[PDB]
Amino acid sequence: PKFDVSKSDLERLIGRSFSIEEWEDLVLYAKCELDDVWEENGKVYFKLDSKDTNRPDLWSAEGVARQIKWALGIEKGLPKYEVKKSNVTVYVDEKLKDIRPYGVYAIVEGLRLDEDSLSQMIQLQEKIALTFGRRRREVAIGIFDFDKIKPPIYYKAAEKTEKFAPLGYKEEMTLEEILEKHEKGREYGHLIKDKQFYPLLIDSEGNVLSMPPIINSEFTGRVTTDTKNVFIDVTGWKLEKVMLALNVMVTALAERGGKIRSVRVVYKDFEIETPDLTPKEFEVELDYIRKLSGLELNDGEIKELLEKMMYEVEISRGRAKLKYPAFRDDIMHARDILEDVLIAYGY
Amino acid sequence: PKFDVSKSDLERLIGRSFSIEEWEDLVLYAKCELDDVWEENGKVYFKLDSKDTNRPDLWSAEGVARQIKWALGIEKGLPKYEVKKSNVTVYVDEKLKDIRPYGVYAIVEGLRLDEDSLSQMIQLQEKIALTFGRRRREVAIGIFDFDKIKPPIYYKAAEKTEKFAPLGYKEEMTLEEILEKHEKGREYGHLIKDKQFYPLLIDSEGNVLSMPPIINSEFTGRVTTDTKNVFIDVTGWKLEKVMLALNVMVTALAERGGKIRSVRVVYKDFEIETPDLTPKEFEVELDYIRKLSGLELNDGEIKELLEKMMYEVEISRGRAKLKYPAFRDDIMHARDILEDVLIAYGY
Amino acid sequence: PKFDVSKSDLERLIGRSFSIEEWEDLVLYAKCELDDVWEENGKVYFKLDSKDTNRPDLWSAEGVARQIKWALGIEKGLPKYEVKKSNVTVYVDEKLKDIRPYGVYAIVEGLRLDEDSLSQMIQLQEKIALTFGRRRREVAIGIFDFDKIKPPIYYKAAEKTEKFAPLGYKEEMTLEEILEKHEKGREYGHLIKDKQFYPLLIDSEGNVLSMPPIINSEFTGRVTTDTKNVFIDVTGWKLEKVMLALNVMVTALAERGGKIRSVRVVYKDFEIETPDLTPKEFEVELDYIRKLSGLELNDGEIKELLEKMMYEVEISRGRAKLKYPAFRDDIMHARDILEDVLIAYGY
């Protein structure tokens, strides 16, 4: 997918500046193409075309800068993410099971936002939901100012006569009226309108954050550039998919200095701590890489290439035990490791 | 004493929510009874009744939540409090020796107040002064917006003709007039009216914070939900009592994310840094616990129980060296340790 | 708590008469003090002050006289109660789960009531509800003439539009109106007024017994001195509390010759037979009693003392296996057994 970014936002993230001519090489390191370059009052913007439809991590400035940092060797190996527990619980209603069953959550603290970072976070929310999340049905992402809500938080099946003021409206309306009148209600309502109850995200004093996957509230938990601590919700139909999307969101914010805090998410039959950023694992024989690539790279050379692709690599007796970031879920087969070696060979 | 709390407030502090039926059991963990339950503007409130006359720590939502966290194992062992030095000094005037001799002080920074947290702070201030403080005579507490005052601060014997606007009045009045005309002047005036001078708390530029133990300024250092940083003064007749009360106020505010800062307190003959939250210490024979309890609990079992009661426990030769929070001053004899063991045995 | 009793009534319960001088000693056996003595058209009354806030069994003439019989050796050991099944079911509506979740029930048959026995039963109802039941919130007790109701009985969540004539009123009112206009509605209504439904106790003909915990009906199941068979309900938030109160009520009535009949109480997820007067159990090392009392009472002497305190005592090799009446719930630690030994040593 395509997305816009600010040249100065990328450069603060990578930590270095580059000419436009150098940027031509840089974008390919992030598996994208430079679709356009323009200025708006002296400020340079790129439209990037992300060539990897299976890597949501690559669809924002944060993910692009991260790749480039590894390509340039400013960092190497597995990116490290510390997650500390918040004191927050979110309850997921079992009555949502056949309506919109899964919610996962995170808090990211200590952010200093501005026009560029806020707009990237919003565009990323939309790009994940459109493509990876199939126009929000599979993955819908909400973001909220954590300082403005009162935990515990409830993701619940609500009566259609419940009320709140949806974004862009100063007065409360029933959930029914929102589906009917709000533009996002018309656009997305079919996902829920025929169910007995609608999903509602609501805090401990009855303030409605949002109605997933339709619209956020006008007055509760609004994110501005003054927002320091963000509360993120991701809902959908498969737990693995909402967790991937959450992982992408929180690691993008970690690139802006955010401190990721886990929350306890309570379902009827189980509880889970999200996000879970435990590195994922894969094993490959290094001679598979040599034989199928047509390249004569020794074990050390292959190790070095995979470290530029954000892998941890432990070789014993010609076989590589790998770890890779929890923000990826595209790795399935040995040929996927081979592809990343071939890519890194270009760096 | 009895005090009111908000259910949602308690739940945000503990981190999870409970049914009213469960809240029946939980209040017992905080040594409280549920005196009443009602709703107001759709919010649920509790009136809690604390039997323990000499545990002011237990008389607010903060202390109640803390006790319940420990009883549920959300935390264990000694709660730890960081105190850093502020750059503030307070001068305590020797001429107050036989009028209202002791003042102790703290700064608590980084607060985010709302209607629940602000009302708990005020209520605790009142409850401490009423019961523990013997209607203010022994312990009186002031709280001020610190951003709005200019250090150093002076707690001094002032002429009766000195002037300020007391709470509720737009116009200044002499100290003498305040005692006559202000409701708290009539209620508490007898504590000081027969002395040559009245206590006054005043900053570097002659702004009167208050006249202890009577009333605060209408216009100087008022506390609102916008207040982030608080200056606390506690005055009375015994240093140990006022320090205890101060420790309770600051540790309650630490539960709200407050950062506690010490103050240099200068008397004619000595100086003290307050608050001092050094844990207090006690030792007991574990055989004493077994014999008097009638419970054959082994040393590991007694240690688990004491950690639920907020003690640090080091055992050697079946003797327990204990640390406990400086917000308590009720522990005097081995039987007080035993009581806590019997209590925890019911969790 | 304080409560009034008739001197002649106490004495028919004990089975013999005493001078006022002798009564001065007797009241202490029941853990009471004489707060007042007076005569009212020919009859002598006492006001008794029960120190034991934890022992509702001691708050009526039946319970006082019982402890006095035991102190005098008229009875010894465990009081025994026979419970036989009635053919009666009471249904407790799961929709009251978060309104007033528990009801328990009993029938006592073969009573010969009079003004003293009737007013004792009524005051005990009040005394238990006030002190033990926290002004009705935790325990509320109703009494009905079982011959005037048609079982099965339903304790249910009722629409606020349902109607009956509350005690002291000849006209039927809606539940809403009762809470609004009845003395007891104003006083206790806050306990239920914010819920979607109100608790109602109703028979199979739709006659309303009561609206717990507010008021009984003027016309349905009224108890008089002609009443022979009593239906008792106890409602609250904790099953063990309401069971304890039920047990106090029925055992008090057994002192008057009442024959206790259990009721099948049907909840959505379980059923219980009430009352359950199975004796409660405790074990203590007799060395403990010697150690803490400082007395060198031998095992048999301690057994004698405990039998005057209504315990069954079985000793094997220095360890006492105790049973005590199910009308008590105050015993939690070994020191509670000790306390009873010390009391009995006073007799």
UniProtKB/Swiss-Prot annotation, chains A, B, C:
> Reaction catalysed by this chain?
tRNA(Phe) + L-phenylalanine + ATP = L-phenylalanyl-tRNA(Phe) + AMP + diphosphate + H(+)
Where it mainly occurs, coarsely classed, is cytoplasm
What range(s) does the B5 domain occupy?
277-347
* Compartments (UniProt record): Cytoplasm
Q: Could you give one GO CC term from the UniProt record?
A: phenylalanine-tRNA ligase complex
Enzyme Commission code(s) on record: 6.1.1.20
One of the entry's Gene Ontology molecular-function terms is:
ATP binding
Keyword Nucleotide-binding listed? The answer is yes
Sites binding Mg(2+) sit at: 330, 336, 339-340
Any idea which UniProt keywords this protein has? Aminoacyl-tRNA synthetase, ATP-binding, Cytoplasm, Ligase, Magnesium, Metal-binding, Nucleotide-binding, Protein biosynthesis
Q: Give the residues annotated as coiled coil.
A: none
The protein's required cofactors: Mg(2+)
Q: Name one GO biological process term.
A: phenylalanyl-tRNA aminoacylation
On subunit structure and binding partners, the annotation says: Tetramer of two alpha and two beta subunits.
Q: Which family does it belong to?
A: Belongs to the phenylalanyl-tRNA synthetase beta subunit family. Type 2 subfamily.
Name of the protein described by the UniProt record:
Phenylalanine--tRNA ligase beta subunit
The gene is pheT
Q: From the entire protein, which fragment is shown?
A: 2 to 348 of 556
